[PDB]
Ligand binder design. Structure first.
Ligand code: CLA
Ligand code: CLA
Ligand code: CLA
Ligand code: CLA
Ligand SMILES: CCCCCCCCCCCCCCCC(=O)OC[C@H](COP(=O)(O)OC[C@@H](O)CO)OC(=O)CCCCCCCCCCCCCCC
Ligand SMILES: CC1=C(/C=C/C(C)=C/C=C/C(C)=C/C=C/C=C(C)/C=C/C=C(C)/C=C/C2=C(C)CCCC2(C)C)C(C)(C)CCC1
Lengths: 122, 51
């Protein structure tokens, strides 16, 4: 529906991307003689995985799950850009602008904090 | 007076204070156990149970 800021404020929903009904399994036709654009792109991380340091003997590193400590400050949104139609037929999104980075700190077992710039700049 | 090596014989006919001594020894042993683990936790490397 049409919610208002006062509906959302303080709930954690401002950090959530919008969603589509289970019944949206259509298709968007792409008119090669047309020019297109992403008017809003929203990314909402749900899990952060960090590769562990396989000791000298190694064998193989794993991607270990981590705990987020910086709260509902993680999503990328309001990202815009043009959707080009290439001539092989493919589509290419070229980010122009948006809120396209969030600093995030997750914590590994043992207590090591791992900051990162979660991002899709360019 | 009592020699140093017999001070604790004053408990031999004092069951309450004998219980009090036994409690204090039990307190000290459990405190040790607690302090020893905390030291081991503060010094233990868990990153390689192989080598
Ligand atoms: C489980 C331990 C324990 C318990 C329950 C008792 C219980 C008792 N003692 Mg015994 N005693 C002990 C250990 C113990 N003692 C030790 C180790 C010694 C050798 C010093 C003695 C020497 C002793 C004497 C000489 C007398 C008693 C007496 C008594 C009675 C009254 C309390 C008193 O004055 O003692 C007080 C005893 C102490 C304050 C000893 C404390 C020792 C400290 C806490 C060790 C800490 C060292 C240091 C801080 C360690 C830290 C690390 C370091 C690297 C810095 C009571 C039955 C008295 C009594 O009625 O008998 C007639 C008495 O006159 N005790
Ligand atoms: C459950 C164990 C236990 C218990 C409750 C007792 C209790 C007693 N013993 Mg026995 N005894 C034991 C084990 C035990 N003993 C063992 C294993 C030995 C062999 C070493 C002896 C040898 C022994 C002798 C030769 C004598 C006693 C005496 C006594 C009485 C007076 C002790 C006193 O005032 O200490 C006073 C002690 C001090 C003020 C300081 C001692 C400090 C020591 C040397 C170093 C401290 C070590 C440190 C605290 C770490 C503890 C050791 C570790 C095991 C935890 C008391 C009834 C005396 C007695 O019969 O009088 C009638 C006596 O003459 N005991
Ligand atoms: C049904 C009665 C009953 C029960 C359950 C016990 C149980 C116990 N007695 Mg024995 N005792 C009894 C009757 C009983 N006794 C009688 C009739 C006498 C003659 C008066 C004695 C004389 C006696 C002596 C002289 C000593 C004991 C000690 C102990 C304790 C040794 C183990 C210990 O400290 O664990 C370690 C403790 C824990 C893990 C925590 C225990 C917490 C429990 C559940 C008690 C909670 C509080 C409770 C309301 C207080 C009453 C305790 C109860 C013993 C009456 C143990 C709890 C020894 C003792 O006190 O050692 C310190 C000791 O020195 N008892
Ligand atoms: C089954 C295990 C067990 C048993 C049977 C005992 C038995 C005893 N402990 Mg306890 N203790 C234990 C585990 C045990 N403990 C644990 C796990 C801890 C935690 C680390 C302690 C900590 C502890 C403290 C802090 C104290 C005792 C004390 C005592 C004695 C009290 C009765 C007394 O007057 O002794 C009469 C004393 C003796 C017979 C002396 C026996 C000497 C023993 C065998 C050790 C040998 C000498 C020693 C190693 C030299 C010390 C060198 C070092 C200081 C550099 C008794 C001998 C108290 C004590 O000794 O009071 C004087 C005391 O202060 N114990
Ligand atoms: C938290 C832990 C804290 C632990 C507390 C520290 C330990 C506590 C005290 C222990 C010290 C014991 C000293 C008692 C010493 C002392 O009091 O002795 C003299 C003492 C005499 O006792 P009596 O029966 O005459 O009683 C008189 C009373 O006033 C004693 O309280 O005999 C005993 O104690 C029996 C054991 C004799 C041990 C004699 C050893 C001889 C050493 C000399 C040889 C040296 C080497 C030279 C050859 C190379
Ligand atoms: C009060 C209280 C509390 C607290 C508690 C605590 C804080 C405790 C502590 C305790 C502890 C913390 C303990 C400790 C202990 C220790 C000890 C007891 C030890 C001893 C040792 C020894 C005995 C040794 C010996 C030796 C040497 C030194 C050398 C080598 C050889 C030998 C081994 C012989 C609470 C809050 C809960 C509650 C309320 C009340």
């Amino acid at each position: 529906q049409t919610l208002t800021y006062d509906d959302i404020v303080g709930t954690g929903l401002a950090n959530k991307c919008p969603t589509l009904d289970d019944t949206a399994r259509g298709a968007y036709p792409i008119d090669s003689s047309q020019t297109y654009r992403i008017a809003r792109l929203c990314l909402q991380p749900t899990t952060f995985l960090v590769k562990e340091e396989p000791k000298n003997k190694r064998q193989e590193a794993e991607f270990v799950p981590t705990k987020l400590v910086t709260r509902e400050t993680t999503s990328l949104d309001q990202i815009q850009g043009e959707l080009k139609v290439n001539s092989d037929g493919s589509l290419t999104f070229v980010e122009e602008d948006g809120i396209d980075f969030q600093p995030v700190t997750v914590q590994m077992a043992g207590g090591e904090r791992i900051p990162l710039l979660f991002t899709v700049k360019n | 007076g009592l020699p140093w090596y017999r001070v604790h014989t004053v408990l031999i006919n004092d069951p309450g204070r004998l219980i009090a001594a036994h409690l204090m020894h039990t307190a000290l042993v459990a405190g040790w156990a607690g302090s020893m683990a905390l030291y081991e936790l503060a010094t233990f490397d868990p990153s390689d149970p192989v080598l």
